[PDB]
């Protein structure tokens, strides 16, 4: 069984470098080659480069000639990749894949864990969430929805719960966007109008990075 294990994501200051290494197992390393693929946002794929550790010889993309640097260690059967001069748009997902037998063709069967990189100049901020509830005095229609806006939090992501996890049916998880160096997301739940506003409801969010939890009444 061929298995390639990667490392964990890291936080890099723009302008510094990064060390990416993923070990290989389940086969013989030096007879085959290695490749790298970058997945840019939102959805795209691009071939970073490859290394065949018999010489060692390599080939890179025309744009990565002055950035990506690859090296290999055959003692621990691992493959390394170095990236320098990181910019704001350099945040992406990298893969560890094994190529053909002394060949770069013959499309690769197995891929990496998908370890990504995070490069930004902004520090961690506690999430600021506020209750949003009706209203002008009437609720239309018979099925009314609620929600709470989670904004001003770093980094992705935050964990949100509804009524201490009592109702898991109507919970909806909305992704965020990138503006002003911060992140803004939301969530939506639907409750019948018969129980509103008789039964209590709340919005609870937890941020694992800064260990900040905020409880509030809608």
């Amino acid at each position: 069984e061929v298995q390639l294990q990667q490392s964990g994501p890291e936080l890099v200051k723009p302008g510094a470098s990064v060390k990416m290494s993923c070990k290989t197992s389940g086969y013989t390393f030096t007879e085959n080659t290695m490749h790298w693929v970058r997945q840019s946002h939102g959805k795209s794929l691009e071939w970073i480069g490859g290394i065949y550790p018999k010489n060692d010889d390599t080939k890179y993309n025309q744009k990565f000639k002055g950035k990506a640097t690859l090296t290999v260690d055959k003692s621990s059967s691992t493959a390394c990749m170095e990236l320098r001069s990181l910019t704001s748009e350099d945040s992406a997902v990298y893969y560890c894949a094994r190529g053909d037998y002394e060949n770069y063709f013959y499309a690769m069967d197995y891929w990496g864990q998908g370890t990504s990189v995070t490069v930004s100049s902004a520090k961690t901020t506690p999430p600021s969430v506020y209750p949003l509830a009706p209203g002008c005095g009437d609720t239309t229609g018979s099925s009314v929805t609620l929600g709470c806006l989670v904004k001003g939090y770093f980094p992705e992501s935050v964990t949100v719960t509804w009524n201490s996890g009592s109702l898991s049916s109507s919970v909806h998880t909305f992704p965020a966007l990138l503006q002003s160096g911060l992140y803004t997301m939301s969530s939506s739940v639907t409750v019948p109008s018969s129980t509103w506003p008789s039964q209590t409801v709340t919005c609870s969010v937890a941020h694992p990075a800064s260990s900040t939890t905020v409880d509030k009444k809608l």
């Binding site: 693929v37 959805k43 795209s44 794929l45 691009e46 071939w47 480069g49 080939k59 890179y60 993309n61 025309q62 770069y104 063709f105 499309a107």
Partner: peptide, 10 residues
């Protein structure tokens, strides 16, 4: 696989 670098699909 025609030539390097490889450009993947959209």
């Amino acid at each position: 696989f025609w030539d390097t670098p490889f450009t993947f699909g959209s």
